[PDB]
Write a protein that binds this DNA or RNA. Structure first.
Ligand SMILES: O=c1ccn([C@H]2C[C@H](O)[C@@H](COP(=O)(O)NP(=O)(O)OP(=O)(O)O)O2)c(=O)[nH]1
Ligand SMILES: [Cl-]
Ligand SMILES: [Cl-]
Ligand SMILES: [Cl-]
Ligand SMILES: [Cl-]
Ligand SMILES: [Cl-]
Ligand SMILES: [Mg+2]
Ligand SMILES: [Mg+2]
Ligand code: NA
Ligand code: NA
Length: 326
DNA sequence: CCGACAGCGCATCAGC
DNA sequence: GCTGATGCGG
DNA sequence: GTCGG
């Protein structure tokens, strides 16, 4: 974190374009610049120095010079003062409320935590739970708690069927000392790219986890993806653990590597890798890596038997999960 | 300049 | 009821 | 907002 001041600035600028301006490309431009600068092993001394890095252009370089000289950015100082922008940025922090709903509520005058609570009636199910656990979802999860959660998930899944294989991905698999949430990749021999010999595969698991009171709420749920809430059990007289966000993805067993690659992230890593893939003439999703014909249309899935095989197709040396945190 | 910028599952809605 | 588009995950 | 062709 040699350039934390600069990266935080780029991140605030990113959120602004995302939440207020609804300009996703500017959002990603800022995030890319922040990321590349985050792994830069030197304390940046000038906008020009930073401009040498890919993803950092003239505009961002000018802002870096402003930030390095004054220790702040006028554009942000003004944005921070703007009531609408402020309110819109804040509301988007509730899970379920994005830029559109945020601006929408702000129009109606609903712009504070208090306002949301006195208007639950104006929230869909997901946004309702997000408000309920607003404080909790703001908290980080120490890796030690992730370990306890991992144990519960793997053992409970094993109890449903010994053939299930639950792998904890996301930032956890990347070695992080704390996570924003828990992401679980699920596989079972009965569900392959070729067939679904068994129904309720994901349901059974969700059900069992709810049975033992690990999963407390549901944000969204389908046959292959579950997005909800969970909580570690506390001992007698012991304060309860904060509620945690949990995501579970059931992927075809034979497409495991593409699935684990995707779910391990990071999101920026995935976007960079998938983009590189396109330039190399391939397309990558959580199921497969396919070549791109002359027309540009995806071809048939190429054989994959490891994460490395995917890296090899696009001519990228293998990168351990811990080195994919972009 | 100008087009590209990753990919997709679930919830919700408009139009039929 | 469906399909298609959009918001959200994030 | 940044980049490549
Ligand atoms: O936009 C996205 C979001 C997530 N993902 C993938 C990569 C990411 O590592 C994984 C889990 O998503 P999270 O939003 O949970 N992110 P991550 O676990 O990396 O970080 P955090 O610690 O915040 O949960 O899903 C994408 O491909 N694109
Ligand atoms: Cl944009
Ligand atoms: Cl994105
Ligand atoms: Cl600032
Ligand atoms: Cl695979
Ligand atoms: Cl596919
Ligand atoms: Mg995560
Ligand atoms: Mg997640
Ligand atoms: Na640059
Ligand atoms: Na939100």
């Amino acid at each position: 974190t040699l350039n934390g001041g600069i990266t935080d600035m780029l991140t605030e600028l990113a959120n602004f374009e995302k939440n207020v301006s609804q300009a996703i490309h500017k959002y990603n431009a800022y995030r890319k610049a922040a990321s590349v600068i985050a792994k830069y092993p030197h304390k940046i001394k000038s906008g020009a120095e930073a401009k040498k890095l890919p993803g950092v252009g003239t505009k961002i370089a000018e802002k870096i010079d402003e930030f390095l000289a004054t220790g702040k950015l006028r554009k942000l100082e003004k944005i921070r003062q703007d009531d609408t922008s402020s309110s819109i940025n804040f509301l988007t922090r509730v899970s379920g409320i994005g830029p559109s709903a945020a601006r929408k509520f702000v129009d109606e005058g609903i712009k504070t935590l208090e306002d949301l609570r006195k208007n639950e009636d104006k929230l869909n199910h997901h946004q309702r739970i997000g408000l309920k656990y607003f404080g909790d979802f703001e908290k980080r999860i120490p890796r030690e708690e992730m370990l306890q959660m991992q144990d519960i998930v793997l053992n409970e899944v094993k109890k449903v069927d010994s053939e299930y294989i639950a792998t904890v991905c996301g930032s956890f698999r990347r070695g992080a000392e704390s996570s924003g949430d828990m992401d679980v990749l699920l596989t079972h021999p009965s569900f392959t790219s070729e067939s679904t010999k068994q129904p309720k595969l994901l349901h059974q698991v969700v059900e069992q986890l709810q049975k033992v009171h690990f999963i407390t709420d549901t944000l969204s749920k389908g046959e292959t993806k579950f997005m909800g809430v969970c909580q570690l059990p506390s001992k007698n007289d012991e304060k309860e653990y904060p509620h945690r966000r949990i995501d579970i993805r059931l992927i075809p067993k034979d497409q495991y590597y593409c699935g684990v690659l995707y779910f391990t992230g990071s999101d920026i890593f995935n976007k960079n890798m998938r983009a590189h893939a396109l330039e190399k003439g391939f397309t990558i999703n959580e199921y497969t890596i396919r070549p791109l014909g002359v027309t540009g249309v995806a071809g048939e899935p190429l054989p994959v038997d490891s994460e490395k095989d995917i890296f090899d197709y696009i001519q990228w040396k293998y990168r351990e999960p811990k080195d994919r945190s972009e």
